[PDB]
Amino acid sequence: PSLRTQPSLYSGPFPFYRRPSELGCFSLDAQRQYHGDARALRYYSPPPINGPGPDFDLRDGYPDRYQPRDEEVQERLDHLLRWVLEHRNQLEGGPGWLAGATVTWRGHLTKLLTTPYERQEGWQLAASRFQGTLYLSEVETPAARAQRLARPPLLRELMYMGYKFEQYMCADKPGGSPDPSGEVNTNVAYCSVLRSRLGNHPLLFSGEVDCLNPQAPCTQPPSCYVELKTSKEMHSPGQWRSFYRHKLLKWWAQSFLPGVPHVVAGFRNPEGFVCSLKTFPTMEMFENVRNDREGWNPSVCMNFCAAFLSFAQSTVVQDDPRLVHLFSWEPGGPVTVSVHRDAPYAFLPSWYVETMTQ
Numbered sequence: 001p002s003l004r005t006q007p008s009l010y011s012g013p014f015p016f017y018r019r020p021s022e023l024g025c026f027s028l029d030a031q032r033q034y035h036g037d038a039r040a041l042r043y044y045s046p047p048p049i050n051g052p053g054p055d056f057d058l059r060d061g062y063p064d065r066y067q068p069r070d071e072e073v074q075e076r077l078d079h080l081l082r083w084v085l086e087h088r089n090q091l092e093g094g095p096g097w098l099a100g101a102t103v104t105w106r107g108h109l110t111k112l113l114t115t116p117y118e119r120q121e122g123w124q125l126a127a128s129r130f131q132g133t134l135y136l137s138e139v140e141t142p143a144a145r146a147q148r149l150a151r152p153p154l155l156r157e158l159m160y161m162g163y164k165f166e167q168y169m170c171a172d173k174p175g176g177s178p179d180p181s182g183e184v185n186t187n188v189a190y191c192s193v194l195r196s197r198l199g200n201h202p203l204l205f206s207g208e209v210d211c212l213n214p215q216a217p218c219t220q221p222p223s224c225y226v227e228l229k230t231s232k233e234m235h236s237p238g239q240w241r242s243f244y245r246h247k248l249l250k251w252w253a254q255s256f257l258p259g260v261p262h263v264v265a266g267f268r269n270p271e272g273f274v275c276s277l278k279t280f281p282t283m284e285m286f287e288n289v290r291n292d293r294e295g296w297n298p299s300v301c302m303n304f305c306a307a308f309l310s311f312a313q314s315t316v317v318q319d320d321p322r323l324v325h326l327f328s329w330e331p332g333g334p335v336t337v338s339v340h341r342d343a344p345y346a347f348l349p350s351w352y353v354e355t356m357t358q
C-alpha cells in the first residue's frame, strides 16, 4: 500500500482541527541542556515608536559571534519524550488519552501539510507504536545529508541572519530592549507543547516558539506568541505573488499548527539589512492566494495530513518500540512504506521505554 499526494484528491471541505491548547513548555540552554521551564523564552520588542525606521544589520557578528548547534548530533524526539515522561500523569483528556494520540514535532507535521505542493524536498518519517501511542520521527534522506554537508556559505550565513533578526526584535525580559551585541547561539530554544486533534486523530506535539508579545491584547498562550521571519525585499507584483504562492504556504503551515497567530517579517535588502517590517496574521495568509489558479489551499494541506495520519495509524498495527514503519516520499510519487527493526531506524530510547513500561 501507498498514499497519493495530489492536491486534487484533497480539495474537499476543511477538516476538523482542534484549537490548540498549550500543555506545557521546555527550554534548551546554550549547551543544549534541557530545562523544564520557560527560561529560553524571549519577548517581542520592536523598534521604538516615532523613531527611525528599522535598519537591522543581519550580517553583524557573522561568524565570530555565531555558535551553531551541532547538526551531527541526532536528537530525534528525545527532548519531547523527556517532557512526556515528566508529565505523563498530568496530561489532559483523561485516562488513556495518550494511548490514542500521535506524538511528534510541529516541524514534521508542517512537512506533511506542505507535501501536496512540494516540488523540491522529499522526506522520510519513522513510525513506532508503543503503548497505543503512535510516534513519528523524521529520518534524514541521502539528499538531505549531502546538501547539509555541502551547505553553501551563503546558506549558512542566511541561517545566521534569520536568528540574528530574532536578536534585533526580542528582549530577555518583558518591556526590555534588544541587545544585538551578544552571541547568536542556536543551541538555545524555547518550545511549546500542545494538544490538538486533526479529524479523529488526537495530537501531542511541540514546536519552537520565537517569542511572546507582551503588547498583545490576548495574553494566553499560544495567542500571545509571535513567529519571526526574514525574506528578501520585493518590489513588483510578480515578486509578491511568488512569495504568496511559495513562502507564505510554509509560514502558514508552520504557525497554523501550534496556533501562533502572527508572523512578523523583516524584509532584507541585498546588502543584508532589514529595512522594513510587516505583520502577517496567520489566519489571513490564505487570502492572498484564495483566487489564485497557482495558489495553495489550507484544506488540501490539512486533508492530506489527515489522510497520512489515517494511513500511518492503519499501517502500524504492531505495538513495539523497536519496530519502525518508515514512510518515504519524494516529489512526483506516492508515500511508500518499508519495515525495519532496531538500528539505525528505531528511535524510542530505552530510558523512555523502560520508564513507561514500569
Ligand SMILES: C[n+]1cn([C@@H]2O[C@H](COP(=O)(O)OP(=O)(O)OP(=O)(O)OC[C@H]3O[C@@H](n4cnc5c(=O)[nH]c(N)nc54)[C@H](O)[C@@H]3O)[C@@H](O)[C@H]2O)c2nc(N)[nH]c(=O)c21
Residues within 6 Å of the ligand: 124, 139, 140, 141, 142, 326, 328, 338
Ligand atoms: C540504504 N537506504 C535504504 N533506505 C530506505 O530503506 C528502504 C527499504 O530498503 P532497504 O535498503 O532497507 O532494504 P532492501 O529493499 O532489502 O534493499 P536493496 O535496495 O535491495 O539493497 C539490499 C541491501 O543493500 C543495502 N544497500 C543497497 N544499496 C545501498 C546503498 O547505496 N547504501 C547503503 N547504505 N546501503 C545500500 C540495503 O540497505 C539492503 O540492506 C528504502 O526504500 C529507503 O526508504 C534508506 N534511507 C535513507 N535515509 N538512507 C539510506 O541510505 C537508505
Ligand SMILES: C[n+]1cn([C@@H]2O[C@H](COP(=O)(O)OP(=O)(O)OP(=O)(O)OC[C@H]3O[C@@H](n4cnc5c(=O)[nH]c(N)nc54)[C@H](O)[C@@H]3O)[C@@H](O)[C@H]2O)c2nc(N)[nH]c(=O)c21
Residues within 6 Å of the ligand: 028, 069, 070, 071, 073, 075, 079, 105, 106, 107, 108, 110, 111, 114, 189, 191, 206, 207, 208, 209, 229, 250, 251, 254
Ligand atoms: C528540524 N529541526 C527542529 N529541531 C528542533 O526540534 C524541536 C522541534 O522544532 P520544530 O519542529 O518546531 O522546528 P521547525 O523549525 O518547525 O522544523 P523544520 O523542519 O525546520 O521546519 C518544518 C517545515 O517548515 C518549512 N519552513 C518553515 N519556515 C520556512 C521558511 O521560512 N523557509 C523555507 N524554505 N521553509 C520553511 C521547512 O522547510 C520545513 O519543511 C526544537 O527543539 C528544534 O530545536 C532541530 N534540532 C536539530 N538539532 N536539528 C534540526 O534540524 C532540528
Ligand SMILES: Cn1cnc2c(O)nc(N)nc21
Residues within 6 Å of the ligand: 162
Ligand atoms: C527560514 N528558513 C529557511 N529554511 C527553513 C527551515 O527549513 N526551517 C525553518 N524553521 N526556517 C527556515
